[PDB]
Amino acid sequence: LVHVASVEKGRSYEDFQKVYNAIALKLREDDEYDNYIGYGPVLVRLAWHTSGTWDKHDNTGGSYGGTYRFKKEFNDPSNAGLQNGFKFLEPIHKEFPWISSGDLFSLGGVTAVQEMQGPKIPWRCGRVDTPEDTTPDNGRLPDADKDADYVRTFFQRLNMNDREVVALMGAHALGKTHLKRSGYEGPWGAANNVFTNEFYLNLLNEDWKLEKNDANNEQWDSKSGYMMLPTDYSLIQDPKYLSIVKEYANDQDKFFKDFSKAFEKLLENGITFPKDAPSPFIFKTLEEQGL
Numbered sequence: 532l533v534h535v536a537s538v539e540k541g542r543s544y545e546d547f548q549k550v551y552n553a554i555a556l557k558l559r560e561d562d563e564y565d566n567y568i569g570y571g572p573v574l575v576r577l578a579w580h581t582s583g584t585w586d587k588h589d590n591t592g593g594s595y596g597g598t599y600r601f602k603k604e605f606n607d608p609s610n611a612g613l614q615n616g617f618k619f620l621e622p623i624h625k626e627f628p629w630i631s632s633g634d635l636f637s638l639g640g641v642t643a644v645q646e647m648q649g650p651k652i653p654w655r656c657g658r659v660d661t662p663e664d665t666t667p668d669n670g671r672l673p674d675a676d677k678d679a680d681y682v683r684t685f686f687q688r689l690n691m692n693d694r695e696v697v698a699l700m701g702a703h704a705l706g707k708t709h710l711k712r713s714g715y716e717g718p719w720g721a722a723n724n725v726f727t728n729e730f731y732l733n734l735l736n737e738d739w740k741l742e743k744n745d746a747n748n749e750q751w752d753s754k755s756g757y758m759m760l761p762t763d764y765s766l767i768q769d770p771k772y773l774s775i776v777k778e779y780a781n782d783q784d785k786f787f788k789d790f791s792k793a794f795e796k797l798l799e800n801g802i803t804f805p806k807d808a809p810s811p812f813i814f815k816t817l818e819e820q821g822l
């Protein structure tokens with residue numbers, strides 16, 4: 532199965548900047564969500580989980596088909612809580628009914644990262660909705676209770692290498708774990724709706740204790756009130772990951788650049804872009820537009 536990007540008919544960069552802007556304005560307006568964290572983090576996670584079902588071996592799952600809109604995928608236990616991101620995007624989709632679902636879920640993530648003062652993420656249009664029977668089964672998203680070997684093997688299926696994995700994991704600066712959702716509780720840091728390299732700094736610099744939470748699962752906790760999942764902590768247990776963690780803790784621009792590449796790649800896995808497709812779009816933030 533080849534998934535060829537097909538530009539929504541007649542649309543160009545300005546159309547998608549209008550969708551960007553509507554997302555960004557609602558992010559600004561709907562600021563109460565999740566104890567004033569706002570929707571940025573869950574939109575980033577929505578983009579990742581709708582992309583992260585991809586299997587490089589047979590091109591099943593991935594962002595192209597926008598299959599999260601079907602009940603098997605929106606009810607995946609791994610996706611618990613993402614319905615909030617979907618509901619956020621609903622009025623956006625109503626205003627811009629021409630955008631595909633995959634394009635909107637992925638664009639939500641791009642828009643969230645950028646509006647949260649993260650790197651620019653080039654974004655390409657052209658995902659096309661595919662039918663209900665193309666929805667991937669549950670179980671393709673990763674478990675959090677595992678070690679570095681698990682993480683490394685997991686991400687090979689998404690064609691991500693060590694650097695790409697460690698960069699992508701930096702998104703755990705954002706938002707928080709919620710006990711009723713994942714069986715883990717707490718934020719990873721203080722700046723959880725501003726995109727920074729804090730995840731790496733906290734991994735290296737906090738004094739972590741291995742504790743059990745109220746769901747009886749182990750997680751790493753600090754006196755500052757932060758947590759790390761076992762899979763996060765694996766990035767400093769594994770010496771290859773550790774080197775990269777230290778690099779990003781010590782170079783914010785490098786983290787931004789590597790995150791941007793890896794996140795675009797994640798969002799584009801499985802998609803074939805024709806030779807004459809438009810170049811990737813780089814959207815202006817609201818701030819850059821004076822909006």
Ligand code: HEM
Binds near residue numbers: 575700702710712
């Ligand atoms: C080994 C890989 C990963 C595992 C096991 C993992 C696991 C988790 C878990 C358990 C949660 C908490 C869900 C909740 O209780 O609300 C979470 C939240 C989150 N994850 Fe991941 N994650 C991984 C990779 C990623 C990647 C690659 C990204 C995106 C680039 C990402 C972005 C997020 C964000 C932004 C949140 C916060 C969501 C919110 O506040 O609502 N994660 N992750």
